Amino acid sequence: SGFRKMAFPSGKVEGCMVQVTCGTTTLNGLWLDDVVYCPRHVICTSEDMLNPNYEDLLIRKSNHNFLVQAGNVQLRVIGHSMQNCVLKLKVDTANPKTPKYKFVRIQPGQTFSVLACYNGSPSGVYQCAMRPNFTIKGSFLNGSCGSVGFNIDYDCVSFCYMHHMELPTGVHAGTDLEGNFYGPFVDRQTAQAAGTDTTITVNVLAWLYAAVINGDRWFLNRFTTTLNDFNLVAMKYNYEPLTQDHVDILGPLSAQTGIAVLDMCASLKELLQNGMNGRTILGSALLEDEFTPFDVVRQCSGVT
């Protein structure tokens, strides 16, 4: 037992990280087959980032201006193209460590692992969630751009995020691996403010189920509620509305614990209204929302 914020094992993604340099800008690339994917802003000077015309800046760049290094070995760039906000650098060598992989675009509330990298070299791995305002709360310094987010289903890596930007408020924005930003964000150094960072209700409920499975039971109360009544309280507390789809997803955890989803919603309603009174759940003094129901089942069942 015990319940931890757990990342996927990072080895399959470590095998794909490379360094990409263009002029004086270095960041990370993702090497899959004979393509390296990286943020298009690799071509920007610090001055360029204010109002960059990427099509115009890219005209001044040739294949030989993209320096791609895998470990301490140089890869030969034989083509480049821009797709949305990513560059695809065709290299003459397929990555021999390419895992089975997919590109997926996740929904707000979905969790993934980030392999934070600098100069193509892995620094650390952590779990986060796509927030309801399409930001992520990461840990990214200068040269972390092109670090990726992913999920693993057995031996298949689903890449869902590539890091591009830090907003003036220190939260993070990026793209899927087709180069489309999550949410309204752009790869320019300009006024971009995030909307409300609401709490991912379905994920809190999953985590409360994890708490019961792991013996933390004090918050269970004698009440129930309805989706509509719960949602009036969720709204007041900047929680995402709970849908019947979410109730259905929490079905397997409902079955495992014998606690009806709406009973757990009524326990959550009291926690919101009453607070924790100085108590902890799974070692947290706040209600954790970066575990999906699938995460809780996966971790509570030991999937590899």
Ligand X SMILES: Cc1cnccc1N1CCC(C(=O)NC2(C#N)CC2)CC1
Q: Which of 38, 41, 163, 265 is flagged as catalytic? A: 41
Q: Does 190 bind ligand X (CB under 6 A)?
A: no
Q: Which of 44, 145, 160, 265 is flagged as catalytic? A: 145
Angle between the 293-301 and 201-213 helix axes, to the nearest 10 degrees? 20
Q: Does 46 bind ligand X (CB under 6 A)?
A: yes
Half-sphere exposure of residue 232: CA atoms within 13 angstroms, side-chain side:
6
**Minimum distance of a copy of itself from residue 11's CB (angstroms):** 3
Of 56, 59, 60, 278, the one binding a copy of itself by CB under 8 A: 278
Give the C-alpha distances (Å, rounded to integers) separating 127 from 30, 180, 268.
Answer: 19, 21, 23
What's the full length of the chain, in residues? 304
**Minimum distance of ligand X from residue 66's CB (angstroms):** 20
Residues in the chain that come right before a backbone break, where C and next N are over 2.5 Å apart:
none
User: Per the structure block, which two tokens stand in for 248?
Assistant: 């259905």
**Minimum distance of a copy of itself from residue 283's CB (angstroms):** 7
Question: Which amino acid appears at position 133 of this protein?
Answer: N
**Minimum distance of a copy of itself from residue 287's CB (angstroms):** 10
Q: What are the DSSP calls for 178-232, one per residue?
A: TSPBSTT--SSSS--------B-HHHHHHHHHHHHHTT--TT--S----HHHHHH
Q: Are 268 and 274 in contact (CB under 8 A)?
A: no
Task: Report the relative pairing of strands 25-32 and 73-75 from DSSP bridges.
Answer: unpaired
Task: Choose from ligand X, a copy of itself, none: what does 145 bind? Cβ within 5-8 Å by kind.
Answer: ligand X
- Residues 4-23 interacting with a copy of itself (rule: CB under 8 A): 4-12, 14-15
Q: What are phi and psi of 94, to 5 degrees?
A: -70, 140
Cα–Cα distance for residue pair 183/170, rounded to 1 Å = 16
**How many CB atoms neighbour CB 248 within 10 A?**
12
Of 39, 109, 138, 146, the one binding a copy of itself by CB under 8 A: 138
- Residues 131-150 interacting with ligand X (rule: CB under 6 A): 140-142, 144-145
Task: Report the relative pairing of strands 25-32 and 35-39 from DSSP bridges.
Answer: antiparallel
Annotated active-site residue 145? The verdict is yes
Of 50, 94, 141, 193, the one binding a copy of itself by CB under 8 A: 141
Q: Does 96 bind a copy of itself (CB under 8 A)?
A: no
Give the C-alpha distances (Å, rounded to integers) separating 278 from 17, 203, 215, 248, 285.
Answer: 43, 22, 18, 32, 7
One character per residue 82-121, x = contact with ligand X (rule: CB under 6 A): ----------------------------------------
Residue 8 vs 54, nearer CB to a copy of itself? 8
Q: Does 304 bind ligand X (CB under 6 A)?
A: no
Of 31, 66, 101, 118, the one binding a copy of itself by CB under 8 A: 118
Annotated active-site residue 41? The verdict is yes
**Minimum distance of ligand X from residue 133's CB (angstroms):** 17
Residue ranges that bind a copy of itself, judged by CB under 8 A: 1-12, 14-15, 115-119, 121-126, 128, 137-144, 166, 170-172, 214-215, 275-276, 278, 280, 283-286, 298-304
- Give the residue numbers marked as catalytic: 41, 145
Binding positions for ligand X, rule: CB under 6 A: 1, 46, 140-142, 144-145, 165-166
